[PDB]
Amino acid sequence: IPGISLNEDNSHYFYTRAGRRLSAEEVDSWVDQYAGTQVKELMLCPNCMRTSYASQVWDPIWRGYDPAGPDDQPLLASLPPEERVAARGWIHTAWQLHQDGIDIYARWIRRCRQRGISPWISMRMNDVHYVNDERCFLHSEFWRENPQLRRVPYRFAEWTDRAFDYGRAEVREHHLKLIRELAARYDFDGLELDWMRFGFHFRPGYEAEGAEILTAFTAEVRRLLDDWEKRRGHKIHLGARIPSRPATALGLGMDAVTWARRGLVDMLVITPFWASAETDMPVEIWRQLLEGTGVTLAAGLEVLLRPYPDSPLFQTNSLETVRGAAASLLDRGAQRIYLFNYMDSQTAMEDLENYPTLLREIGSLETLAGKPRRHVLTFADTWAPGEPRAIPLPATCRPGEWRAFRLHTGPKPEPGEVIAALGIEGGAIGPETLEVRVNGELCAFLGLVDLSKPRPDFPVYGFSVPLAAMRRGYNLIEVTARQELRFGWAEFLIRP
Amino acid sequence: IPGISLNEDNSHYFYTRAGRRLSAEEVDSWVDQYAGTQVKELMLCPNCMRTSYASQVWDPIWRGYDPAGPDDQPLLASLPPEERVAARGWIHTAWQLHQDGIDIYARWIRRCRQRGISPWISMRMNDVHYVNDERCFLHSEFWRENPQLRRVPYRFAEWTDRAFDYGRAEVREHHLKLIRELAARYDFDGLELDWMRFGFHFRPGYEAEGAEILTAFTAEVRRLLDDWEKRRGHKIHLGARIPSRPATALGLGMDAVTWARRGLVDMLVITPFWASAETDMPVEIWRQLLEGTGVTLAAGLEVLLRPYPDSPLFQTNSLETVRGAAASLLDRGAQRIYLFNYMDSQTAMEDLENYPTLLREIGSLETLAGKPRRHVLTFADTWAPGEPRAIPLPATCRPGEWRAFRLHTGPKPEPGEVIAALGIEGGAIGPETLEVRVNGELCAFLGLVDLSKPRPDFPVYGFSVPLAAMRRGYNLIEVTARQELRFGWAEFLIRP
């Protein structure tokens, strides 16, 4: 009964369906796969710097496009030949839909409500994909013509260095033009402000002024949706995607607690940016912070599952690891699981055959109960400029030294098997090299565990945990090594 | 004004006054030094595992003590000869005060009340000094006799490994016995549960059971003090010391938000343990978390000022660095500055001559306004077991890489000088080796800055900050190096 909010990105459908002349029937059919699942909202994303629909106030993705032209034309010249094919798949599908009189978002909204699903629009507030390429097809001419409105003029080490400065009146007006249009054109149940594309909206050091600025921006959004409530004749919700930890959120100018108390938002999605799902987010603290605000707290997952920032592994969540994350987050008080990058092809879980099952399971403690789950230790990819970073992995244990990992495994395990599993980097160990404890209780060596994807490319050793040791919420692995070892990977596998 | 809470420890007064037969008059005069200052409460600590007064339910410090005996007597046998002198200083001074019919805490309370100070009692809930020495004079026989009631049977790597487990009913009953005595013996304005001595009260992994357990204990303490409120004829306060971040506090089984909303406490002191004052604590988040509960939030300082956990420096805070910390925390919303280990001698500030100045200044932004101050980058000493740790220093910058440090400098500087100062560990920089920006603005090279204590034992390079670049709250130092460099120190010096 918590249920699922599922984000469809601005590019995905247009990439994957490229080369088909799409009917209105086919466009409608995309919604159907979500019908009869635990999905309660579809977060339809229509924009990056450019819109995928035929905007009057912004550049559509197909501005500058020669439909009959060669791949090597001005709009695509700046890409290597192979990437032209994929960009043009997005540009042409988006364009051809418009040429055929099909507004893909109007059709998805309408179809959502026939299928009992609540349709939302989710705007990317500050997308910066490929800003290293000034001539790239998907940048707005507004962005190309106005380098003075970027965040960081004194260097370029990161894409976010060329993000728009929301400190500027010009930049806010530019984003509010898109919103006024989205509210006029589309009869959505709610508008999501997606600050998490890419999280960085202010000059470094100006984030406190920025906080006051984004609260006032949010209030205008609410004030405008209140008008459209009267025009549409039903309630319109306003939500936002913000960082996973309160301090990082306030440090990037997102004072969501003020938004919630002033009645500006009624949904908050705490989430990472992209590098990895966070299996561990302080939901319970957010729940105290939002007490009495009537706001729906949504725990955001991302498709990637990686143990540390610098890992060369780029594997996605499985059904078992989303069951793990979802079990934990609901256990902590998440009033929704929110999927970002869990689409029906290309950007999707590694085990796509289990997507129907995933959408019928991860929305409830009841539907996860007694099912194989994996609770994997990751990290938070987004920190406010100069904020010290807390990254568990990797972790060296010198001989006779103790190392601890806390992993959130949510509901107490049902009768069955519990493994603490630990991967060791380098090139290894005896069954008495580690001493492994969970909540103080000795764990028996099991040996090499053969993991399903996602899995590291180094040995993973399994440790059998006494059932009764496991608690509700966090559980503590404690480990001492007789030899110096680097841990690259930690998890609990629970098999009832 | 917010004002000052000042903690006098269980040991200090008896250590420093050893060797003099003390008169009631001299005992009383100790309170007078705190009269007419911004000090509002004295937090008078009367215990570790043993009491400094003549307790009838716990061991006084002098249990085992032969007044007439040689230093080499069974109570002090386990210490090296020259530490027996200091130990016996405390024990003898404490013991002699009882024999002269002087109750130091009854007199202090009384004298506080005459000099318009609010007198508190602060109990150490789980002190473990020197628990490596099971024969040590300051451990309770109850501790010595009950190894099975400790937190961690499976290893001894830290003193907190031999702390009492409040998971056990006999451990809570043991501490409730002293509270029942302290409430009957002493007519205090409030009782402070000092959980931060040493902050670790539960078996590793049981900290969520712990949360329910400490809340139910705190409630019992509140119900007890409600009885004494009726006998004493006036309101009795309950406060507590807890970790500096909300996740770490809940992670150590201290759910102070529950305590506050259920009206169990009316004061909370966010604080480090010992290793360094924290110049940066999320006061503003605690203020949101505590909204409507009627609790006073106090920001706790410690006397040490150290850049990172493993630094070999052990210098203390100065008047300038305490003004720095105090300006910041008060700006962030602290309703009190709390000092721990800032006493009149031995354990105190490096510049003791400035103690009367400090006690009339750091309680208000008004009295701090227009005075030199130093905002030094430190670190949180205390993390929940297996909680990922965020430590800013030391920081390596590779050639052509960017490193940022956010430092909280509180109120916008008045007209005058601002220096960003950066200390470099290991073996030779030029005036262009570093590019230093504050809030994006270029800072001019100044050269080697000769710092007042506290100061690192490596070169400190100063950068002149355009006055107008400084903002209220955090200020961001960005630096890129042309050579690989490790930073061991970072501060803002503001000179009005």
Nearby residues of A457 by Cβ (< 8 Å), 6 or more positions away: A313
Chain A residues inside the 8 Å CB shell of B276: none
Phi-psi region of B318 (alpha: psi -120 to 50; beta: other; left: phi over 0): beta
Q: Which two tokens stand for residue A399?
A: 């001989």
CA neighbor of B288 nearest in space, from A438, A140, A290: A290
Q: How far apart are CA A58 and CA A61, in angstroms?
A: 9
Q: How far apart are CA A225 and CA A238, in angstroms?
A: 8
Among A148, A200, A212, A387, pick the best mutation site for testing chain B contact (most B Cβ within 10 A). A387
Q: How far apart are CA A193 and CA A122, in angstroms?
A: 6
Adjacent-strand bridge partners of A462:
A421, A447
Residue in B208, B407, B478 nearest the CB of A472: B208
| B contact residues 473-492, partner A, Cβ 8 Å cutoff | 473-478, 480
Pairing of strands B485-495, B474-481: unpaired
Contact call for residues B329 and B399 (beta carbons, < 8 A): no
Please name the residue of chain A whose CA is at the shortest distance from the CA of residue B392.
Answer: A388
Residue B265 has phi, psi (to 5 degrees) of -110, 160
**CB-based contact, A207 to chain B, within 8 Å:** yes
Q: How far apart are CA A260 and CA A239, in angstroms?
A: 10
C-alpha A409 chain-centroid distance: 20
- Distances A99 to A57, A104, A148 between C-alpha atoms, Å: 18, 12, 36
Q: Which two tokens stand for residue B156?
A: 């001894």
- Per the listing, tokens 């099912």 go with A371
- Per the listing, tokens 């230790």 go with A377
- Which DSSP symbol is given to B387? P
Chain A residues inside the 8 Å CB shell of B390: 387-390
CA neighbor of B8 nearest in space, from B106, B120, B107, B127: B120
Please name the residue of chain A whose CA is at the shortest distance from the CA of residue B403.
Answer: A386
**CB-based contact, B152 to chain A, within 8 Å:** yes
Q: Do A250 and B475 touch (CB under 8 A)?
A: no
DSSP assignment string, A125-140: SS--TTTT-TT-TTS-
Report the Cα–Cα distance between both ends of chain A, in Å, rounded: 23
> What length does chain A have?
496
| Nearest CA distance, A163 vs chain B (angstrom) | 15
- Burial class (CB within 10 angstroms; exposed 0-12, middle 13-18, buried 19+) of A72: exposed
CA neighbor of A329 nearest in space, from A284, A372, A294, A292: A284
The continuous run of DSSP H or E covering B332 comes out as helix B319-332
Among B168, B259, B383, B476, pick the best mutation site for testing chain A contact (most A Cβ within 10 A). B476
| Nearest CA distance, A243 vs chain B (angstrom) | 15
Q: Do A246 and B437 touch (CB under 8 A)?
A: no
CA dihedral B351, B356, B362, B363 (to 10 degrees): 160
Contact call for residues A141 and A50 (beta carbons, < 8 A): no
Pairing of strands B373-376, B485-495: antiparallel
| B contact residues 387-416, partner A, Cβ 8 Å cutoff | 387-392, 401-402, 404-407
**CB-based contact, B216 to chain A, within 8 Å:** no
